């Protein structure tokens, strides 16, 4: 279970990095930080 | 909201955002510019 | 009467892959005496993909000539794919066509040291005529790739020969394939002239280092009207590796007016290497012989099946004769306990 969850978390982290890279390189009003925080909380949720 | 990229999807995934390639720092108050110009004519010889 | 239709569509942005350069043209010509000429050329250019086409149809009454080519080429860092097709069709009195198809790719993924390549030429030459068919194609192709999970290399050569003329059918198939681990030649020959005869000949030769060799040869000659059937069926199989032994199958017979004889002979001595160093001793003798005549007949079947230490011979032989009637059953078998 630890190995499988580690692999899934690695894939999720790759996706998160890609999405954050897309978000940063786009115009936004105030929501970049909100999305980044949501993604980080999602990573913590995955670990839990 | 009106500064979002506009394109025809030959490739759906963008390695670099079109705005990022445009290097703009667009804000809400920046007036985005759009202008469509179309002419159509059907010609009949006046020499009958 | 002629129409000129030209199109130039250019949608430009950044990310050159996203930029295309389209051009389409269409031209038609038609005099009152009706020789017609049509031509088309469509071009698009985007960095990701480029495909080109040109077609020019002509119609001089009975004479019709069609030319149409399309070539597409994909270009990316990992791989560059290339496909090209040229089509030449002409119809004056017969309908003869050629359509050539070249395929190519060179895919390389150095992340795991993977490289794949395959060039395929798929060409058709065909002729149609009332009373004659001339069809043939060459399935020529080769391959190579080296990957830690998979590595192969070899050449494939397939030729298909078909033809029609009169009441006789001619068809020739011959497949010759070579590979690092598998080598095989497959020739097939068939011919039958109207309702007179039928010639069937098979040539299968499979080469495998791990299994050993296997030879299958068999030939057929059937003559109609007289009801004669005489096909020669033989085969030799050498087994190597986990299964080691020899399997021989002799299939002989002769169907003749008022005379029919069948000779089937299946023989095998097999020693199967099971896991844990256990060997199954399979040795069997399955032998058949039949004869048929209007006044007398006979059938004989003999089996001598033996497994490891258990041996079984089953004997049966029936013979029909006016002088004597034969009826015997021989059953014998031992099973060590």
From Swiss-Prot, chain B:
Superkingdom per UniProt: Eukaryota
Coiled-coil segments on the chain, per record: none
Record's protein name: Apolipoprotein B-48
Organism: Homo sapiens (Human)
Lineage start: Eukaryota, Metazoa, Chordata, Craniata, Vertebrata
């Amino acid at each position: 279970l630890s190995q499988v969850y580690s692999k899934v978390h690695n894939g999720s982290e790759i996706l998160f990095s890609y999405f954050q890279d897309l978000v940063i390189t786009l115009p936004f009003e105030l929501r970049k930080h909100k999305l980044i925080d949501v993604i980080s909380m999602y990573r913590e949720l995955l670990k839990d | 909201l009106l500064d979002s990229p506009i394109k025809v999807p030959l490739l759906l995934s963008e390695p670099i955002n079109i705005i990022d390639a445009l290097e703009m720092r667009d804000a809400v108050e920046k007036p985005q510019e759009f202008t469509i110009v179309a002419f159509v004519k059907y010609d009949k010889n006046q020499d009958v | 009467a002629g129409i000129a239709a030209s199109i130039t569509a250019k949608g430009e942005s950044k990310l050159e892959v996203l930029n295309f350069d389209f051009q389409a043209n269409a031209q038609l010509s038609n005099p009152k005496i009706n020789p017609l000429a049509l031509k088309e050329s469509v071009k698009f250019s985007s960095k990701y993909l480029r495909t080109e086409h040109g077609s020019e149809m002509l119609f001089f009454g009975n004479a019709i000539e069609g030319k149409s080519n399309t070539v597409a080429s994909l270009h990316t860092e990992k791989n560059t794919l290339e496909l090209s097709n040229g089509v030449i069709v002409k119809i004056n009195n017969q309908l003869t066509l050629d359509s050539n198809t070249k395929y190519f790719h060179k895919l390389n993924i150095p992340k795991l040291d993977f490289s794949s390549q395959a060039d395929l030429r798929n060409e058709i030459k065909t002729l149609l005529k009332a009373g004659h068919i001339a069809w043939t194609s060459s399935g020529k192709g080769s391959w190579k790739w080296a990957c830690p999970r998979f590595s192969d290399e070899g050449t494939h050569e397939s030729q298909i020969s078909f033809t029609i003329e009169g009441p006789l059918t001619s068809f020739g198939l011959s497949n010759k394939i070579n590979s690092k681990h598998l080598r095989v030649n497959q020739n097939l020959v068939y011919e039958s002239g109207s309702l007179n005869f039928s010639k069937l000949e098979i040539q299968s030769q499979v080469d495998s280092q791990h299994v050993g060799h296997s030879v299958l040869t068999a030939k057929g000659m059937a003559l109609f009207g007289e009801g004669k059937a005489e096909f020669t069926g033989r085969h030799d199989a050498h087994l190597n590796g986990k299964v080691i032994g020899t399997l021989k199958n002799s299939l002989f017979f002769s169907a003749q007016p008022f005379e029919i004889t069948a000779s089937t002979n299946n023989e095998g001595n097999l020693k199967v290497r099971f896991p844990l160093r256990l060997t199954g001793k399979i040795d069997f003798l399955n032998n058949y012989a039949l004869f048929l005549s209007p006044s007398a007949q006979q059938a004989s079947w003999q089996v001598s099946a033996r497994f490891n230490q258990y041996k079984y011979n089953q004997n049966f032989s029936a013979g029909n004769n006016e002088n004597i009637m034969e009826a015997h059953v021989g059953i014998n078998g031992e099973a060590n306990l």
